[PDB]
């Protein structure tokens, strides 16, 4: 079971690590029992009044979309070229 | 009169332009292009001389042409001279240029789509007549039909708007010819130390008989031409005659009549026949590009340029400028086939600068070739 | 008199080709093309080529230079190719205006 699982276990750990890091992004910086200060401050700020998942300006968003399209075209062209130079296709 | 244009539409982009008259010296236009707009002297100039006709290229052929042209231009800093009008092959080519510009992570080499369009064929010219230096004029983009008037393509970064000549109705063509000739006599780099003469090349896509005079004038100015095999217009006539091998008056008259039945004017037909004969008399400036067979536009461009230079003169110094161009595109096979084949003697002092360029530009194949060649 | 027509005659050699559908489509498109050069005539043949998912035959015969194809012409044929799960014809029609 160890031999069969280890490779998938690594991938599952990475996938879980994503969620845990996202979870630590929003967590208050003060560990409990101190965390009560952070909770009180957050509640008071809510009553009175993200590096991941960011929104970009229109120009930058359009530039990134075109760049992604260009990269996709290059990747598909590379796939087609590698298929054309394959031994089976040459034969 | 210089002004900036702020296109309004799907993608908000800013473009520059300048109104220019037929009596202007091309030196001033080149100077303002290089300095005022900050455009570096290009390493390659490709001029489109067609695609404005009613008939259009097939979408597959159009896409192949645009992809090949952009891929060939991306190697160095290239200019793409087109009519800055949103129509036909020009629209798609400018769109491809803009897409490459956005996706290019290296701004060191830039593909610039210059637009030379007649003033009387501009839609909403009054909108850009403002040209306030503090506030660039806002210009709306509209996909007009064929008609006779178009809107400026938003994908062309710079424009050259030429007023109609009251003498003759060919102001834009004469201006394009003069600009190409003047650009062909410049230097690729900032200084004349390791810089070559700028390679100016023309591309023909479904020409009309009206452009034969301008094409012959360009040939007289000794600039190479590339002819699409399946374009549709004069390109088919030229490729068929070159495939035939010899051109005679009856054959070219029959082919022109078959391809352009609408054109029925004896004087015009005779003039076009003479123009075609004089054009084919050069030959060394003519080259065929077949996307179905080769589809390697950079290879054809280099072959045409080296063929033109070799026909011009047999001096090794003439090939040296072509040798640097072959180095710049890392086409060692083309260089070995054409420049380094028996005829041209190459001394060690001749290859010093070219060896430096190959060494400092990370091209190992040319380093090996030069070491093997003295 | 039979051989005088010719465009209505086609040879099937099972030893060489053995692809009866290919020969059938080639014969039908040849007959229609000899009948008339109008693009509407090929459109009926284009739908038949779509129905059998023979994109190579269509590209060789119908979509070769001579026949002009407008966007409005390909609307119904594009619908048929799209709704009949033929992706090759979808790509061909997108590439053709």
DSSP symbols for B88-146: HHHHHHHHHHHHHHHH-S-TTS--EEEEEEEGGGBTTHHHHT---SSSPEEEE-----S
- Return left, alpha or beta for B131; rule: phi > 0 is left, psi -120 to 50 is alpha, else beta: left
Sheet containing B286-289: order of strands: B137-140, B2-8, B14-20, B158-162, B112-118, B78-82, B44-48, B200-204, B225-228, B286-289
Which neighbouring-strand residues pair with B288?
A: B227
Cβ distance A71 to B103 less than 8 Å, yes or no, reads yes
Which neighbouring-strand residues pair with B203?
A: B48, B226
CA angle at B287 for the pair B159 and B271, rounded to the nearest 5°: 80
Q: B touches which chains (3+ CB pairs under 8 A)? A: A, C
B102 touches chain A (CB under 8 A): yes
Min CA distance, C89 vs chain B (Å)?
14
Cβ distance C96 to B63 less than 8 Å, yes or no, reads no
Residue B233 token pair: 């217009």
* Alpha-carbon span B90 to B81, nearest angstrom: 10
Location of structure tokens 């006539």: B237
DSSP B325: H
Nearest to residue C30, comparing CAs of C62, C72, C53, C4? Answer: C62
Phi, psi of B113 (to 5 degrees): -100, 95
Strands B286-289 and B158-162: unpaired
B148 touches chain A (CB under 8 A): no
3 state DSSP class of B222: coil
Q: How does B192-229 read in b/e, with b if 16+ C-beta sit within 10 Å?
A: eeebbbbbbbbbbbbbebebbbbbbbbbebbbbbbbbb
B254 within 8 A of B225, measured Cβ to Cβ:
no
* Alpha-carbon span C22 to C51, nearest angstrom: 13
For B258, half-sphere exposure in the C-beta direction (CA atoms, 13 angstrom radius) is 10
* Alpha-carbon span B273 to B253, nearest angstrom: 6
State the CB neighbour count (10 A cutoff) for residue B292.
Answer: 10
Instruction: With residue C49 as reference, give the H or E element that holds it.
Output: helix C39-51
Compute the Cα dihedral for B297, B299, B300, B306 and give only its sign: positive
DSSP B165: P
Nearest to residue B196, comparing CAs of B18, B374, B76? Answer: B76
Strands B2-8 and B14-20: antiparallel
| Closest alpha carbon within chain C to B232 | C65
| Closest alpha carbon within chain B to C91 | B60
* Alpha-carbon span C51 to C43, nearest angstrom: 12
A67 touches chain B (CB under 8 A): yes
Nearest to residue B31, comparing CAs of B39, B42, B23? Answer: B39
A80 is in an annotated binding site: no
* Alpha-carbon span C58 to B21, nearest angstrom: 51
For C74, half-sphere exposure in the C-beta direction (CA atoms, 13 angstrom radius) is 20
B280 within 8 A of B241, measured Cβ to Cβ:
yes
Cβ distance A70 to B12 less than 8 Å, yes or no, reads no
B343 to B337, B338, B348: CA distances (angstroms)? 12, 10, 16
B51 within 8 A of B66, measured Cβ to Cβ:
no
Phi, psi of B54 (to 5 degrees): -65, -45
- Kindly report the three-state secondary structure assignment for every residue of A26-57: CCCCCCCCCHHHHHHHHHHHHHHCCCCCCCCC
B64 within 8 A of B295, measured Cβ to Cβ:
yes
A-B Cβ pairs (cutoff 8 Å, strict): 19
Compute the Cα dihedral for B76, B77, B82, B87 and give only its sign: positive
* Alpha-carbon span B140 to B6, nearest angstrom: 9
Q: Residues of B with CB below 8 A from A61's CB?
A: none
Alpha-carbon dihedral of residues B154, B160, B165, B169, nearest 10 degrees?
Answer: -50
Instruction: With residue C21 as reference, give the H or E element that holds it.
Output: helix C20-35
| Closest alpha carbon within chain C to B56 | C97
Strands B44-48 and B14-20: unpaired
Q: Quickly count helices (H) and strands (E) in chain C.
A: 6, 0
B306 within 8 A of B322, measured Cβ to Cβ:
yes
CA angle at B370 for the pair B365 and B374, rounded to the nearest 5°: 155
Which neighbouring-strand residues pair with B45?
A: B79, B200
- Experimental technique behind these coordinates: cryo-EM
Min CA distance, A53 vs chain B (Å)?
22
Q: Which residues contact B168 (CB under 8 A, 6 or more apart)?
A: none
Nearest to B99 among A58, A59, A70 (CB): A70
Instruction: With residue C87 as reference, give the H or E element that holds it.
Output: helix C87-94
Residue B334 token pair: 């083309």
B302: Cα separation from own chain's centroid? 13
* Alpha-carbon span B233 to B203, nearest angstrom: 13
Q: Which residues contact B59 (CB under 8 A, 6 or more apart)?
A: C94, C95, C96, C97
Interface mutation target, options B54, B60, B63, B239, chain C, most CBs of C under 10 Å: B60
B328 within 8 A of B306, measured Cβ to Cβ:
no
Min CA distance, C11 vs chain B (Å)?
30
* Alpha-carbon span C97 to B59, nearest angstrom: 6
Instruction: With residue A25 as reference, give the H or E element that holds it.
Output: helix A2-25
Residue C74 token pair: 């390909």
B12 touches chain A (CB under 8 A): yes
3 state DSSP class of B187: strand
Q: How does B119-129 read in b/e, with b if 16+ C-beta sit within 10 Å?
A: eebbbeeeebe
Q: Which residues contact A14 (CB under 8 A, 6 or more apart)?
A: none
B247 within 8 A of B241, measured Cβ to Cβ:
yes
Location of structure tokens 């290239």: B78
* Alpha-carbon span A57 to B318, nearest angstrom: 50
3 state DSSP class of B286: strand
Residue B9 token pair: 């539409």
* Alpha-carbon span B17 to B22, nearest angstrom: 16
Residue A6 token pair: 């280890």
Phi, psi of B150 (to 5 degrees): -130, 170
Alpha-carbon dihedral of residues B185, B191, B192, B197, nearest 10 degrees?
Answer: -30
B152 within 8 A of B164, measured Cβ to Cβ:
no
C95 within 8 A of B67, measured Cβ to Cβ:
no
Location of structure tokens 């559908």: C21
Cβ distance C97 to B60 less than 8 Å, yes or no, reads no
B329 within 8 A of B302, measured Cβ to Cβ:
yes
Q: Where are the alpha helices (DSSP H) in chain B?
A: 26-31, 59-74, 88-103, 125-128, 171-183, 212-220, 234-244, 249-259, 266-282, 297-312, 316-328, 332-338, 352-360, 364-371
CA angle at A76 for the pair B44 and B232, rounded to the nearest 5°: 55
State the CB neighbour count (10 A cutoff) for residue B344.
Answer: 17
Nearest to residue B13, comparing CAs of A67, A70, A55, A58? Answer: A58
Based on the number of CB atoms within 10 Å of its own CB, is C63 exposed (0-12), middle (13-18) or buried (19 or more)? Answer: buried
Q: Residues of C with CB below 8 A from B230's CB?
A: 65
Which neighbouring-strand residues pair with B8?
A: B140
Instruction: With residue A60 as reference, give the H or E element that holds it.
Output: helix A58-84
B14 touches chain A (CB under 8 A): no
B288 within 8 A of B304, measured Cβ to Cβ:
no
Instruction: With residue C55 as reference, give the H or E element that holds it.
Output: helix C55-61
Min CA distance, B103 vs chain A (Å)?
4
Cβ distance B58 to C96 less than 8 Å, yes or no, reads yes
Location of structure tokens 């029992």: A33
Nearest to residue B93, comparing CAs of B125, B136, B62? Answer: B62
Q: How does B138-170 read in b/e, with b if 16+ C-beta sit within 10 Å?
A: ebebeeeeeeeebbbbbbbbbbbbbbbbeeeeb
* Alpha-carbon span B349 to B333, nearest angstrom: 23
Min CA distance, B56 vs chain C (Å)?
10
Q: Do chains C and A touch (3 or more CB pairs under 8 A)?
A: no
């Amino acid at each position: 079971t160890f031999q069969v699982v280890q490779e998938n276990a690594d991938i599952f750990w990475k996938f879980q690590r994503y969620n845990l890091i996202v979870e630590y992004h929003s967590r208050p910086a003060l560990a409990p029992p101190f965390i009560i200060i952070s909770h009180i401050t957050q509640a008071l700020l809510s009553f009175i009044k993200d590096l991941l998942e960011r929104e970009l300006p229109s120009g930058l968003d359009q530039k990134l979309m075109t760049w992604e399209t260009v990269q996709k075209e290059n990747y598909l062209a590379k796939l087609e070229h590698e298929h054309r130079e394959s031994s089976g296709e040459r034969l | 009169r210089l002004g900036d244009i702020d296109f309004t539409g799907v993608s908000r982009t800013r473009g520059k332009f300048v109104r220019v008259t037929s009596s202007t010296d091309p030196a001033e236009i080149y100077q303002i292009l290089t300095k005022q707009w900050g455009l570096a002297p290009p390493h390659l100039v490709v001029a489109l001389m067609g695609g404005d006709e009613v008939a259009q290229l097939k979408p597959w052929l159009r896409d192949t042409l645009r992809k090949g042209l952009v891929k060939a231009a991306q190697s160095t800093g290239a200019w793409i001279l087109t009519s800055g009008l949103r129509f036909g092959i020009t629209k798609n080519l400018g769109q491809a240029v803009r897409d490459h510009s956005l996706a290019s992570t290296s701004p060191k080499v830039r593909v610039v789509a210059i637009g030379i369009a007649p003033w009387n064929m501009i839609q909403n010219r009054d909108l850009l007549l403002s040209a306030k230096p503090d506030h660039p004029a806002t210009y709306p983009t509209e996909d007009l039909p064929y008609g006779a008037v178009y809107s400026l393509d938003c994908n062309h970064s710079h424009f050259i708007l030429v007023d109609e000549d009251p003498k003759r109705p060919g102001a834009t063509g004469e201006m394009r010819v003069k600009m190409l000739k003047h650009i062909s006599l410049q230097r690729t780099g900032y200084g004349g130390t390791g810089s070559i003469e700028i390679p100016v090349l023309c591309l023909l896509v479904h020409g009309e008989p009206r452009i034969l005079q301008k094409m012959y004038k360009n040939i007289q100015n000794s600039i190479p031409w590339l002819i699409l095999a399946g374009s549709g217009g004069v390109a088919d006539i030229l490729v068929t005659l070159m495939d035939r091998g010899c051109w005679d008056a009856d054959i070219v008259q029959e082919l022109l009549i078959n391809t352009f039945p609408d054109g029925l004017h004896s004087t015009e037909i005779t003039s076009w026949t003479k123009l075609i004969q004089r054009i084919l008399d050069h030959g060394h400036l003519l080259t065929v590009h077949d996307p179905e067979q080769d589809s390697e536009l950079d290879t054809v461009i280099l072959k045409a340029l080296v063929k033109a230079c070799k026909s011009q003169s047999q001096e090794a110094q003439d090939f040296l400028d072509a040798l640097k161009l072959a180095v710049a595109w890392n086409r060692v096979d083309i260089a070995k086939s054409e420049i380094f084949s028996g005829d041209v003697q190459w001394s060690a002092q001749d290859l010093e600068e070219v060896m430096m360029e190959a060494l400092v530009n990370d091209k190992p194949d040319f380093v090996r070739l030069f070491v093997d060649n003295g």
